[PDB]
């Protein structure tokens, strides 16, 4: 039979963006940046062998992902609301949903190997993802009564590549939007402002 597996691998680092003092009738940036390091498989999804020992062919899909919220609370209970500025060359994708951000960029597909490797790693084994890609640009609308103060504000996303290994040529999967949505969320962008009012 013809297979497919589907392996999510997540990223998990913590970064920090310093918005400095900032009033509510602007919109202050934060850049999140794609650091390559060790992954997690957080998620699979595969019907074939779990080893390709360097003798056979398969096929691979590898999407590189990143989940966003689109509105976050702060620590006292107000909320902050997530625009895109400027996502690069990622595909933006389900914009209908109404909590997260989905960006995507499909790098490879139909590309045929015999690479020793391993086609469908568990969950909570990990591998060091290589793969480079460019930043995402956010913006924050702040709410008009946010109280005047210092703020730090931790934003969990999700990260990683979906690595999709199948026994045939033109093999195309997608993890659903809804699963993506679930993945947990092993990075952090911790965003720090003070709001001098405005």
Same mark, same amino acid.
């Given at each position: 039979?013809?297979?497919?597996?589907?392996?999510?691998?997540?990223?998990?680092?913590?970064?920090?963006?310093?918005?400095?003092?900032?009033?509510?009738?602007?919109?202050?940036?934060?850049?999140? $940046?794609?650091?390559?390091?060790?992954?997690?498989?957080?998620?699979?999804?595969?019907?074939?062998?779990?080893?390709?020992?360097?003798?056979?062919?398969?096929?691979?899909?590898?999407?590189?992902?990143?989940?966003?919220?689109?509105?976050?609370?702060?620590?006292?209970?107000?909320?902050?609301?997530?625009?895109?500025?400027?996502?690069?060359?990622? $595909?933006?994708?389900?914009?209908?949903?109404?909590?997260?951000?989905?960006?995507?960029?499909? !790098?490879?597909?139909?590309?045929?190997?015999?690479?020793?490797?391993?086609?469908?790693?568990?969950?909570?084994?990990?591998?060091?993802?290589?793969?480079?890609?460019?930043?995402?640009?956010?913006?924050?609308?702040?709410?008009?009564?946010?109280?005047?103060?210092?703020? $730090?504000?931790?934003?969990? !996303?999700?990260?990683?590549?979906?690595?999709?290994?199948?026994? !045939?040529?033109?093999?195309?999967?997608?993890?659903?939007?809804?699963?993506?949505?679930?993945?947990?969320?092993?990075?952090?962008?911790?965003?720090?402002?003070?709001?001098?009012?405005?």
């Amino acid at each position: 039979m013809a297979w497919n597996n589907i392996v999510f691998y997540s990223l998990g680092d913590v970064n920090s963006y310093q918005g400095g003092n900032v009033v509510i009738t602007q919109r202050p940036q934060f850049i999140t $940046s794609w650091r390559p390091g060790i992954a997690t498989v957080t998620w699979n999804q595969c019907n074939g062998p779990e080893f390709a020992d360097g003798s056979w062919a398969y096929y691979r899909e590898y999407i590189a992902w990143v989940v966003f919220p689109k509105k976050v609370m702060t620590k006292n209970g107000y909320p902050l609301f997530i625009e895109v500025h400027n996502k690069g060359s990622w $595909s933006e994708e389900n914009t209908g949903d109404n909590d997260s951000y989905f960006f995507l960029k499909g !790098y490879k597909w139909d590309q045929r190997a015999f690479d020793t490797a391993n086609l469908c790693q568990k969950p909570g084994e990990t591998t060091r993802l290589t793969e480079k890609f460019d930043d995402i640009i956010f913006k924050v609308a702040l709410p008009a009564d946010l109280p005047l103060g210092d703020y $730090s504000v931790t934003i969990p !996303y999700t990260s990683g590549i979906q690595r999709h290994f199948a026994s !045939y040529l033109g093999a195309r999967f997608k993890i659903p939007y809804n699963v993506a949505k679930t993945l947990p969320r092993e990075n952090e962008m911790l965003f720090l402002f003070k709001n001098i009012g405005g």
